[PDB]
Amino acid sequence: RKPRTPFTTAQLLALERKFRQKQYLSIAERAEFSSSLSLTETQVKIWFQNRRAKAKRL
DNA sequence: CACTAATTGAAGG
DNA sequence: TCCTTCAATTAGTGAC
């Protein structure tokens, strides 16, 4: 498997507000956004995926 | 347990 | 036959 990534409180604030701006990223956006935070595209993809789930639960 | 990152796996492209 | 999405699942950390 793979260890949980400990996102920073700052990465997490960015991810949250990016998600507040739009809950989906296009590929280019994601490529850009992940580089901006120094996280892998997969990390961001999965964080958005998981957050969309949480947001559906609520 | 709550929360959340990661896995898996189907349906759609 | 790579990749997205969602649904469900698995599992790490951490409160109670």
UniProtKB/Swiss-Prot annotation:
Compartments where found: Nucleus
Phenotype caused by lack of the gene: Knockout mice die shortly after birth. Development of mesenchymal molar tooth buds is arrested at the bud stage, as a result of reduced expression of Bmp4 and Lef1 in the dental mesenchyme at 13.5 and 14.5 dpc, there is no change in expression in the dental epithelium. Decrease in the expression of the Wnt signaling gene Tcf7, and an increase in Dkk2, Sfrp1 and Sfrp2 in the mandibular molar tooth mesenchyme at 13.5 dpc. Expression of Dkk2 and Sfrp2 expands into the distal tooth mesenchyme in mandibular molar tooth buds at 13.5 dpc.
Protein name: Homeobox protein MSX-1
Organism the protein comes from: Mus musculus (Mouse)
Mod. after translation: Sumoylated by PIAS1, desumoylated by SENP1.
Taxonomic placement: Eukaryota, Metazoa, Chordata, Craniata, Vertebrata
Family note: Belongs to the Msh homeobox family.
Chain's role: Acts as a transcriptional repressor. Capable of transcription autoinactivation. Binds to the consensus sequence 5'-C/GTAAT-3' in downstream activin regulatory elements (DARE) in the gene promoter, thereby repressing the transcription of CGA/alpha-GSU and GNRHR. Represses transcription of myoblast differentiation factors. Binds to core enhancer regions in target gene promoters of myoblast differentiation factors with binding specificity facilitated by interaction with PIAS1.
Included stretch of the parent chain: 173 to 230 of 303
Quaternary structure and partners: Interacts with CREBBP/CBP, TBP and SP1; interaction with these transcription activators may inhibit autoinactivation. Interacts (via C-terminus) with PIAS1 (via N-terminus); the interaction is required for the localization of both proteins to the nuclear periphery and specific binding of MSX1 to the core enhancer region in target gene promoters. Interacts with H1-5.
DNA-binding region per UniProt: 1-58
